[PDB]
Amino acid sequence: MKANEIRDLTTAEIEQKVKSLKEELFNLRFQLATGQLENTARIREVRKAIARMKTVIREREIAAN
RNA sequence: UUAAGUUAGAAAGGGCGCACGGUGGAUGCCUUGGCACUAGGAGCCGAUGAAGGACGGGACGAACACCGAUAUGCUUCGGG
Structure with missing residues (x-):
């Protein structure tokens, strides 16, 4: 997924995607x-996806505080 | 034929010259690296964990380089 899309999903929704990707x-x-x-x-592609998601999550949590 | 005299050539190997090779890296060209300065910058980093390291990360060995369980890379803003 591209950041734009990941940025649209809710934080919870993101967490789920991460779980799924880790199983793949x-x-x-x-x-x-x-x-x-x-x-x-496919291996490399999945790893980078997981990172893209975690980046978005942290950015939201920093913004909060 | 006999006698008495003279000399030549001989290479197991060796010496000198010549022809042809081997080994070994001088010499000549060359530059990836240095040396001495000049004109400007900049003159500190660290408990929000430094300097320096250990261990790891690639589809498939070791090493260098890069990176840190988000690990041969992630986001954004620009250039191209």
Whole structure:
């Protein structure tokens, strides 16, 4: 997701997305170890998404205080 | 044929010269790095945790470089 969109969702809604993304990464890693992953580029993409979300969250909490 | 005399050549190896190689990195060109200064900046960082490090981060080894569980990068504002 691009920041613009992430910025539209509610904080709670963001947290959920982060949870989901973290599960995708777990699964992706297990597939790689076994030997059933083709798009390995997916791994990096997921990691960066998780970061994008956490950045938005912190920015909102700083703004508050 | 006999006798008495003279000399030559000989290379196991070696010496000198020449021809041709090997080894080894002088010499000549070259510059990625230095040395001495000049004219301006700037002359401190740290308990809101410094200087310096250890350990880690890539699809796939080690190392350098970059980064810190948001880990080979995140957001924004500009350039291109």
